[PDB]
């Protein structure tokens, strides 16, 4: 009531019930993917780390931030009856790299992934938008012993660049092609 610790706990609980939210308002989505917000189950994001260098000076070392080492996104997802997620991944990696082996233009196979925060009214607001491309889904296991859960897999996407996060629409007269 009037004790210092009671005051502290009262303040804490009031500001907690007034300023705290559980991990409710979130939404992951990708351009060109329908229902992906549903099929995705987990996300792990890292924009980039920044590396420091140490310098010897007397009895002290001084570390200085040097350069943004990129990160990656990894999405854990279950698929549908038709394997539409695997279909999309197949298409994506095909556009990324020619199976003939040549290098594709790094503009046609780049996807704009975005996570928004929901609202109490269902509205969404931007939280993070990356321009990424697929790299690998990892070594995945499939069998019959999965007798209580569905076969699900992660996909790893690498950002195009930690610099100049730019994109454009292919749907135009001047497409993603250029003039040599």
């Amino acid at each position: 009531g009037v004790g210092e610790r009671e005051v502290g706990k009262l303040t804490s609980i009031i500001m907690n019930k007034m300023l705290f939210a559980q991990g409710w308002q979130f939404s992951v989505e990708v351009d060109g993917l329908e229902g992906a917000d549903f099929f995705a189950k987990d996300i792990t994001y890292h924009d980039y780390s920044i590396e420091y260098e140490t310098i010897k000076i007397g009895g002290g070392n001084i570390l200085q931030p040097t350069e943004r080492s990129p990160g990656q996104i990894t999405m854990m997802v279950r698929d549908t009856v038709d394997g539409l997620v695997l279909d999309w991944f197949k298409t994506a990696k095909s556009r990324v790299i020619n199976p003939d082996g040549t290098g594709n233009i790094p503009s046609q196979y780049l996807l704009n992934v975005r996570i928004y925060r929901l609202l109490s009214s269902g509205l969404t607001k931007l939280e993070n938008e990356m321009t990424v491309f697929p790299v690998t889904t990892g070594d995945v296991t499939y069998a019959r012993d999965q007798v209580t859960e569905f076969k699900s897999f992660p996909m790893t996407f690498a950002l195009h660049s930690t610099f100049n996060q730019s994109s454009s629409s292919l749907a135009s007269l001047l497409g993603f092609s250029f003039s040599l």
Partner: peptide, 13 residues
């Protein structure tokens, strides 16, 4: 949840 000063709190889920 637990906060500073050993405070316990309960939140919706």
């Amino acid at each position: 949840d637990y906060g500073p000063n050993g405070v316990k709190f309960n939140q919706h889920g």
